[PDB]
Design the sequence.
C-alpha cells in the first residue's frame, strides 16, 4: 500500500521526503552546440520533484566520455551553468538532486567523441551493442559500437582527474551530490566484470585488481566533495551493454563492502536494464544489505507493491522508478493513490524537444 515508501529518509546531511527515486535517464535533449543542459530539461526535472531524490541522466565528464548524441556534459563552464538552471528549478520545488557522472568507455562511436577511438580496460569490443549518433537530422542514428583501445596508466590518471573535477563542477552547478555510473557496461564496469577485462597489470588479473579503478575513482570523488555527497551505481547481473562477470555474487558483494569502507552515502543497484531482467536472488540482495550499510537503492521494473515489499523485507531503503517517471511527472502521487499510470512513448525517449519530455500531464480524473 506504500506506507514505507512514503516515509522520509536521511541521505547524508539531507532529509528526503519519501523513498522514491527518479533514476538516471538519458533523454538526449542537451542544447547544441556544446551539449548544454537547458530550460526544457529544468522544467522536466522540476515536474518530477515530488520524488524523494532525483538522479540526473548520465552527464559526461569529458569529450571522450560521451556515448550518445546530445547528452549533457558537465565539464565546460556553460555546461555547469546549464545544470545550475536545472538544480535551481528542482530546488525551488523542494527536492534533492545528484548528478550522474558518466564515462561510457567502449560503449560509444567515434562520431560522439570527436573522431577519437573509444577507450576501455582492454581492446574488447562490446558485443551486440549499439549507441546512437547525430547524422544531420533530429532523429537518433543507431550504430554499432567501435573497438576500443586499452587504457594506459596515464589514461587512468586522466580519467580519475576528470571524474574528480566533474564532482567539483557538479557542486558548482548546485547539485546536492553525485552518483558515479559504475554500472550498465560503461567504463568502470568494463574493469569490474571479468569477461570485459583482460588486463595483465594491477587493474586486471584478480578481484582486487578488477575493483582497483572503482576504488581509486571513488577515493578521488570522496576526497573532492565528501563521502556524504557520493553515491555509486552498480549492475551486478545485467549484461545488456556487454559486460559479464564470471562470479558476480563474489565480485559485487566485494564491491559493496569496498564501497562501504569509503562510506559512500548510497549504493544504487540497477536491477533491470531495458528488458534485461535477470533473476536477482533475495539471498544475494540480503548479502548486499550486509556488505553495504548506507542507503541502498534498487531500480528495475518496480511497481508500488514490489517497491513497498522490498523496503519492508529489509532489502532496500529507496526504490527508483524509471520508465514510469518518464510518463508520470506526478508518479509519487499516483503510486500513493493507486491512480493509473500513463505509459511512455519509446519514440520520444531520445532527442527532439519538449514533446515526450515535458508534456506528459499530471493525473486528472
Ligand atoms: C530513456 C532511458 C534512459 C536511461 N539512461 C540511463 C542513464 O543515463 N544512466 C543510468 O544509470 N541508467 C539509465 N537508464 C536506466 C534506468 O535508470 C533504470 O535503471 C531502468 O530504466 C530500469 O528501471 P525501470 O524498469 O523502472 O524503468 C535509462 C532508462 C531509460 C528508460
Ligand atoms: C516563476 C515561474 C518562472 C517560470 C520560468 C519559465 C521559463 C521558461 O523558459 C523557456 O522555456 C522554454 C522551454 O519550455 C524554452 O524554449 C525557452 O527558450 C525558455 O525561455
Sequence:
Amino acid at each position: 500500500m506504500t506506507q514505507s515508501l512514503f516515509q522520509p529518509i536521511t541521505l547524508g546531511a539531507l532529509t528526503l521526503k519519501n523513498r522514491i527515486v527518479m533514476p538516471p535517464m538519458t533523454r538526449s535533449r542537451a542544447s547544441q552546440p556544446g551539449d548544454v543542459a537547458n530550460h526544457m530539461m529544468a522544467i522536466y526535472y522540476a515536474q518530477r520533484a515530488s520524488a524523494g531524490l532525483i538522479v540526473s541522466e548520465g552527464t559526461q565528464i569529458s569529450p571522450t566520455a560521451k556515448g550518445y548524441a546530445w547528452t549533457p556534459g558537465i565539464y565546460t563552464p556553460e555546461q555547469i551553468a546549464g545544470w545550475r538552471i536545472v538544480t535551481e528549478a528542482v530546488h525551488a520545488k523542494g527536492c534533492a538532486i545528484f548528478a550522474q557522472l558518466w564515462h561510457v568507455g567502449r560503449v560509444t562511436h567515434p562520431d560522439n567523441i570527436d573522431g577519437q577511438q573509444p577507450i576501455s580496460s582492454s581492446t574488447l569490443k562490446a558485443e551486440n551493442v549499439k549507441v546512437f549518433v547525430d547524422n544531420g537530422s533530429d532523429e537518433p542514428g543507431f550504430v554499432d559500437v567501435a573497438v576500443p583501445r586499452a587504457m594506459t596508466k596515464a589514461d587512468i590518471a586522466q580519467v580519475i582527474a576528470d571524474y574528480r573535477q566533474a564532482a567539483l563542477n557538479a557542486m558548482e552547478a548546485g547539485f546536492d551530490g553525485i552518483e558515479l555510473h559504475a554500472a550498465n557496461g560503461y567504463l568502470i564496469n568494463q574493469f569490474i566484470d571479468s569477461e570485459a577485462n583482460n588486463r595483465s597489470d594491477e587493474y586486471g588479473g584478480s578481484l582486487e585488481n578488477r575493483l582497483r579503478f572503482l576504488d581509486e575513482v571513488v577515493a578521488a570523488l570522496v576526497d573532492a566533495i565528501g563521502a556524504e555527497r557520493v553515491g555509486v551505481r552498480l549492475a551486478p547481473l545485467t549484461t545488456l551493454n556487454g559486460t559479464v562477470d564470471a562470479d558476480p555474487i563474489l565480485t559485487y558483494t566485494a564491491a559493496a563492502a569496498l564501497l562501504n569502507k569509503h562510506r559512500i552515502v548510497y549504493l544504487h543497484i540497477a536491477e533491470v536494464d531495458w528488458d534485461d531482467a535477470p533473476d536477482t536472488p533475495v539471498s544475494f540482495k540480503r548479502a548486499l544489505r550486509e556488505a553495504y550499510q548506507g542507503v541502498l537503492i534498487y531500480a528495475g521494473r518496480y511497481n508500488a507493491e514490489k517497491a513497498e515489499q522490498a523496503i519492508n523485507d529489509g532489502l532496500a531503503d529507496m526504490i527508483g522508478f524509471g520508465r514510469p517517471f518518464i510518463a508520470n511527472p506526478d508518479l509519487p502521487e499516483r503510486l500513493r493513490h493507486g491512480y493509473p499510470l500513463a505509459e511512455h512513448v519509446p519514440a520520444t525517449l531520445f532527442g527532439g524537444g519538449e514533446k515526450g519530455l515535458t508534456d506528459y500531464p499530471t493525473y486528472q480524473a
About this structure: Residues 39-40, 43, 354 surround octyl beta-D-glucopyranoside (ligand 2) (CB under 6 Å). The chain is about 30% helix and 15% strand. The CA atoms of residues 67 and 176 lie 25 Å apart. The longest strand covers residues 53-60.
